[model samples]
Target: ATFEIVNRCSYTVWAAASKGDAALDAGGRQLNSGESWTINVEPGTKGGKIWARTDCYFDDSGSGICKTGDCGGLLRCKRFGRPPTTLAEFSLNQYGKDYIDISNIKGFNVPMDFSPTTRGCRGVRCAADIVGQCPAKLKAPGGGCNDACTVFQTSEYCCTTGKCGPTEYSRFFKRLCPDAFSYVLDKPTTVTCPGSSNYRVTFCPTA
Candidate 1:
């Protein structure tokens, strides 16, 4: 089962770490002052846990995500789709309610420096790092092309690599804050599940 939380205080409630399926004897460490809610999944929940700087002793994964450092207790590790090159968190005012898809990451490292005003609008520059930069002929998705959409719409990549042709990779957007008013959280929300093309709440707590 997935859990939700609400901050009941006036100040910003900073999350230091997260733990799930923790010992019943240990009360939750109050990282901030907020009325939060946690629900234990009745087994069969699809999610994993993420520990901070510390290592976890439990065999289970996807309980709830820790802040960034290691703190144990079966915290969830929500399965974010791709291996991140750079992970930066942002705040969006005007966000309300708690949504799993709104609590993970901002965007993937696409070649956004590439001009978004060109004819092809090649989303990101395909470099040695991007296999799409050098594609083999006669493959499904080959070569490179422009990405016309903004970073908010999703990072666009080309599909000239034959096998990876006309491809656009979707990223997982995790909204750190989802209850403000000035802005909307537009983080990436992609997941890495076999046969699945998008991220689901189940994937957050596990695989």
Candidate 2:
């Protein structure tokens, strides 16, 4: 996933080499007194590497770089650095002539260890990189306000004021239109709410 080396030296050090199938570009790079370098890995498959010391000072007073220096073996070796913790290990039959049924695995827990994260790119608005964050059902007008009534056509398909009676349906349409001109007359009667006797209601289709 990521390759890193922590510098525990007392003074500045220059990298002399990186060992393994996966390579790094820190050969001649200088790390200030006590720092670190993280290498990048390519996608797909797996590999490992190591860091070896060339010279070091046991003491600051006139002492030259020590001979037979310390060598650090990284990735899955406690000899120098920490070993690679197994994140996940599963077996797939490579030589199977018949199909294996995996539907029986209805429930299983996957274990993992997530550590040492970098916050360089957290909570950044990536509008171009991400699409469609909204749920599909949230876009619907589901207040039951679209249900047609005897007097009004549920804000959509309005009916004439005369077509509406002292009914709950007509009241709904009137609440939406409030103006008689917006509604269409399904009947020739003077459309009005039965008790309110109001003709100031119109109806239109829901948006």
Q: All candidates' TM-scores? A: 0.18, 0.24
Q: Give the TM-score of candidate 2.
A: 0.24
All candidates' lDDT scores? 0.23, 0.24
Q: Candidate 2 lDDT, tens digit per residue, 1-207? A: 343434443544333222233233443233454466654433231222232232334333322332211223221222221111111111112232111111000010111111123321111000110002212221112111122321133434333344443334333333332321112432222211112110100001010
Candidate 2 regions exceeding 4 Å error are: 15-22, 56-207
lDDT of 1 by residue, 164-193 (tens): 222222221112122111012232332212
Please tell me which predicted candidate would have the highest lDDT against the true structure: 2
For model 2, state the Cα shift of residue 112 in Å.
23
Count of clashes, each model: 67, 11
